[PDB]
């Protein structure tokens, strides 16, 4: 294209761009802190810190029904799980660790696929 290339537009071409990165995080290495999502007790503080508490178990599951097609939507959820890992993991756990390595692989994939509604 010319200028303005990254930009997912088609809903349709996004549901895959989107299916794809949700599916290479899962297979990602920093992806089995959220794959199943944490019990309510058995984090410091989930049920406050986190007032989205949102993982990888709803990401996929809502792109099979399409439920995610947007930049800013996909986008905030996936960025929603590595700062929501910090923000209940403080500065010394695999928690902080994988996000901020999931993240950044995240970000280069839709930096690529031309999403980041930022
Ligand atoms: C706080 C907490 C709660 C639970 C877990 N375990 C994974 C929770 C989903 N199986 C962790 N963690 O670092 O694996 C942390």
């Known amino acids: ?6 930009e997912p537009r088609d809903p349709d071409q996004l549901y895959s761009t989107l299916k794809s990165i949700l599916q290479q995080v899962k297979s990602h290495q920093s992806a ?4 199943e999502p944490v019990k309510r007790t058995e984090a410091p503080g989930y049920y406050e810190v986190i007032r989205f508490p949102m993982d990888l178990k709803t990401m ?13 939507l996909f986008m905030a959820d996936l960025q929603r799980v590595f700062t929501n ?6 500065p010394e756990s695999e928690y902080y660790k994988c996000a901020n390595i999931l993240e950044k692989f ?9 999403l980041i509604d930022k």
Not at 1 to 6: I, L, N, Q, V
Not at 85 to 90: G, L, M, R
């Open 60 to 72: 996929s599951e809502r792109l099979k029904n399409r439920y995610y097609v947007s930049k800013k």
């Open 32 to 35: 089995w802190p959220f794959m």
């Open 106 to 114: 995240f970000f280069s994939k839709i930096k690529e696929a031309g």
């Open 85 to 90: 890992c910090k923000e209940y993991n403080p």
């Open 1 to 6: 294209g010319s200028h303005m290339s990254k």
